[PDB]
Amino acid sequence: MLQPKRTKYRKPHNVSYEGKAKGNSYVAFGEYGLVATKGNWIDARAIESARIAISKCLGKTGKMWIRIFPHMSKTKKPLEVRMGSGKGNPEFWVAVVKQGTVMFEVANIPESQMIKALTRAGHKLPVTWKILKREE
Amino acid sequence: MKVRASVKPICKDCKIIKRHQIVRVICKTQKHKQRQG
Amino acid sequence: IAKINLLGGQAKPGPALASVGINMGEFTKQFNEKTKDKQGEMIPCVITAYNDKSFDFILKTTPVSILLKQAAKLEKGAKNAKTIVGKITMAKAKEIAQYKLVDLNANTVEAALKMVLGTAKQMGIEVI
Amino acid sequence: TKADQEKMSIALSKLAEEDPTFKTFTDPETGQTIIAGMGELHLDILVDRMRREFKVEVNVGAPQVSFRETFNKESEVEGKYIKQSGGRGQYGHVKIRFEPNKDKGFEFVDKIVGGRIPREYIKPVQAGLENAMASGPLAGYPMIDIKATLFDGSFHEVDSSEMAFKIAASLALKEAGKVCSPVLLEPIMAIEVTVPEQYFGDTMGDISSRRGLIEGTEQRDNVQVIKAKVPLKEMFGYATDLRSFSQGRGNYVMQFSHYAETPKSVVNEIIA
RNA sequence: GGUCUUGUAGCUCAGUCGGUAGAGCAACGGUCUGAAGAACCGUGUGUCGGCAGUUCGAUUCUGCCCGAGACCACCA
RNA sequence: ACCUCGAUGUCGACUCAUCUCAUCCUCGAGCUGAAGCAGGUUCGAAGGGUUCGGCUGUUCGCCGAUUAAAGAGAUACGUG
RNA sequence: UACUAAGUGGAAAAGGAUGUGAAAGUGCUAAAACAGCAAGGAUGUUGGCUUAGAAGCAGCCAUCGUUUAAAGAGUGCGUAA
Numbered sequence: 001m002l003q004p005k006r007t008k009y010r011k012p013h014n015v016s017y018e019g020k021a022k023g024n025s026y027v028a029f030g031e032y033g034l035v036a037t038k039g040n041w042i043d044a045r046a047i048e049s050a051r052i053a054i055s056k057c058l059g060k061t062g063k064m065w066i067r068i069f070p071h072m073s074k075t076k077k078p079l080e081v082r083m084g085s086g087k088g089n090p091e092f093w094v095a096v097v098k099q100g101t102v103m104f105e106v107a108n109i110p111e112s113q114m115i116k117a118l119t120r121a122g123h124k125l126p127v128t129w130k131i132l133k134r135e136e
Numbered sequence: 137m138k139v140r141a142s143v144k145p146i147c148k149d150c151k152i153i154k155r156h157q158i159v160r161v162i163c164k165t166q167k168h169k170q171r172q173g
Numbered sequence: 174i175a176k177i178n179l180l181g182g183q184a185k186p187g188p189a190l191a192s193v194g195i196n197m198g199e200f201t202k203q204f205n206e207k208t209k210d211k212q213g214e215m216i217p218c219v220i221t222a223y224n225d226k227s228f229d230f231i232l233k234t235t236p237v238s239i240l241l242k243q244a245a246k247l248e249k250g251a252k253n254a255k256t257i258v259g260k261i262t263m264a265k266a267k268e269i270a271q272y273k274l275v276d277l278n279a280n281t282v283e284a285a286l287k288m289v290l291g292t293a294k295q296m297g298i299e300v301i
Numbered sequence: 302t303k304a305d306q307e308k309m310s311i312a313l314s315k316l317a318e319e320d321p322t323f324k325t326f327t328d329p330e331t332g333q334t335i336i337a338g339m340g341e342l343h344l345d346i347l348v349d350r351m352r353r354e355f356k357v358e359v360n361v362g363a364p365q366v367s368f369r370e371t372f373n374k375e376s377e378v379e380g381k382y383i384k385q386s387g388g389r390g391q392y393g394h395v396k397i398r399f400e401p402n403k404d405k406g407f408e409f410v411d412k413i414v415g416g417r418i419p420r421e422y423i424k425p426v427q428a429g430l431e432n433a434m435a436s437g438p439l440a441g442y443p444m445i446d447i448k449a450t451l452f453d454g455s456f457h458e459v460d461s462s463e464m465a466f467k468i469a470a471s472l473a474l475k476e477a478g479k480v481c482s483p484v485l486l487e488p489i490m491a492i493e494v495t496v497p498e499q500y501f502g503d504t505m506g507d508i509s510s511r512r513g514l515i516e517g518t519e520q521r522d523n524v525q526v527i528k529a530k531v532p533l534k535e536m537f538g539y540a541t542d543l544r545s546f547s548q549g550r551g552n553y554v555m556q557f558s559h560y561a562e563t564p565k566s567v568v569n570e571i572i573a
Numbered sequence: 574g575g576u577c578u579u580g581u582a583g584c585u586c587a588g589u590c591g592g593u594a595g596a597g598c599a600a601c602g603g604u605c606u607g608a609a610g611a612a613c614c615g616u617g618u619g620u621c622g623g624c625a626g627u628u629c630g631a632u633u634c635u636g637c638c639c640g641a642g643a644c645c646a647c648c649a
Numbered sequence: 650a651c652c653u654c655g656a657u658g659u660c661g662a663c664u665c666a667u668c669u670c671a672u673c674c675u676c677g678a679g680c681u682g683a684a685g686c687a688g689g690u691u692c693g694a695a696g697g698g699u700u701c702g703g704c705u706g707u708u709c710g711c712c713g714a715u716u717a718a719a720g721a722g723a724u725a726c727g728u729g
Numbered sequence: 730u731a732c733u734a735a736g737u738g739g740a741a742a743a744g745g746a747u748g749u750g751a752a753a754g755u756g757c758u759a760a761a762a763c764a765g766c767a768a769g770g771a772u773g774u775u776g777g778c779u780u781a782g783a784a785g786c787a788g789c790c791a792u793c794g795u796u797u798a799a800a801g802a803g804u805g806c807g808u809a810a
Contacts, residue, residue: 173745252778254791291794517782
């Protein structure tokens, strides 16, 4: 439950995640960044799985910076229900990934560790991961 | 004979071959045999 | 082939010198008598076929690396090479170089001293 | 079965007449039938004979090690016992300090200076602790090498006879044994496996199959003999394991080396 | 999926709608007691289910989550 | 909510079974933490076959025994 | 003018690819490039700790110094050594 503390509305239109970056198109605090070639929804489950995949192989010297947060959510209607009752309750929180944006960056650790971590975590998401080096 | 979706040399002897446009990996150890990709 | 690294005492246990065809007692007596002057210090020893390998032995000139431990003001070996205990004078190093002068496969003072430095930079003592 | 054990004794006593080189006992440590012979087929035909001629039908057992118990320091102790029984009532409050240490056994210290307890109740609690040290919380194994230091106590009016103190001490010792999470101890043995380097690789493999201690080799005057520190429980199958891999070309000796704290791999089996 | 309820001490229970965490028993010490029953004084235990807000300040007020409890969801 | 309700015979049991391999057995073969026996994994492979009883309407499901093994998915969960 | 060897064309995903053709940065080489082949590949060095025996090679401290085109506590294999 990566919950934004205050939510005026919790039942918005689902998401249209296709679109280019609206900022943070450069590696600011880290040295290797994860670029997305295709936007998507990510539930808290996949976010946590990717985060722990990175952290398991993350060394003591290295430091990580997140560039995303589940600012959105998603509901879910159970099975065998006739269509139309309003909308369901938000079951979890959704991070929206626009294509061309960077979600995570790493630094303060040798390059081999960074690239191995990124290649290791790339298979945890449907999004086609791409590696990006240190930017300004 | 095993099937995967990725083939890289796991060992230093795991060479990659394409017999009849059919990809296989051959290594000194007979455990290290696979074919796909 | 079948090189042995042993002390100056007996030769019973080592399965590298007496495992080629040389009898145990007939030469362990000779070694423990002749090398008695050098008993307690290791001497690497090598062997080769003579015509049946009934007896063919030779010993390398004894290196001072074992005595480099006591030259380092130590009584027993140390795991780390970053620990310092005591200080070694230059005369001891010169005597070490001259002692292994006929031991080292080369012959010159500077090379022997630098080689001792190299095997002592890892041992735990920095030569002077 | 009890009758099975009796007929086993009858068969083995007569089988000793036919073959006196094995030894038969009943273990005061586990109660099993302890049969000692010299080989797989030998024991197999022994059981075959006692089931054919003497008609003794019994399945196979499993040897075990007594795994004695030690533990850590207790808070002090808090022992209480209040019951109306024993021809009268019974009230008793005790607080000793009971410290386990494998260097010194049962040392009892008395520190009464204000008169909190008479000397008539010192020997009772001493005896109670001495006889209650024999049982443990894990599996009843003895709690050895523990020192007792009496510090506080309290009795009632003309009530509270002697046995109240002993019962309170037993309850306190039980609670103390439960709270300190005790650990076990097994006798590790030295095994002098003998082989003229013919099956030395097999020796390393077989030793490592029991998590082992393989570190090097040494020679005795005509052969090479290897010292291995082995637990007692895994040696019973290790006999036929070593015999099989060496193809019946190896002998050894089993003697008490020292008592070592059980590894957690043995400890996890006690929790209930 | 809604209709709601339940989780509090070692046991079972209330919970000044915010102004506290509480006995009894589990269990301990003392006191009285022809003996012994007897009764009393009191040792001790409490993320008050968890997380967030609200609130002077939260166990209480609000939302979410987890464990449990009952209401329906394939026909002419 | 789609053709079909001036009718689209639907549960089960027996019989015809047929098809398909994402093969259960029989088979070829590779590898092994595959001494042998006994194995496990995997590719090919449909030529052939894949038991009977007690119980509940019962394919479901339970039990028992047995065979090289006693497969699974489909045909209006086929068949008035 | 070019590509293709999948009948791709003439159905598809992530992923994989020592695939093919092409383009550009740069290096080496006929004083002969990567080879293969013929060779050396040594030395303190069982360096010292570890477990009586762990010692080019379980592992650990240093992880170097000499002859020297070059030799590495060795590139791996093989031993408890």
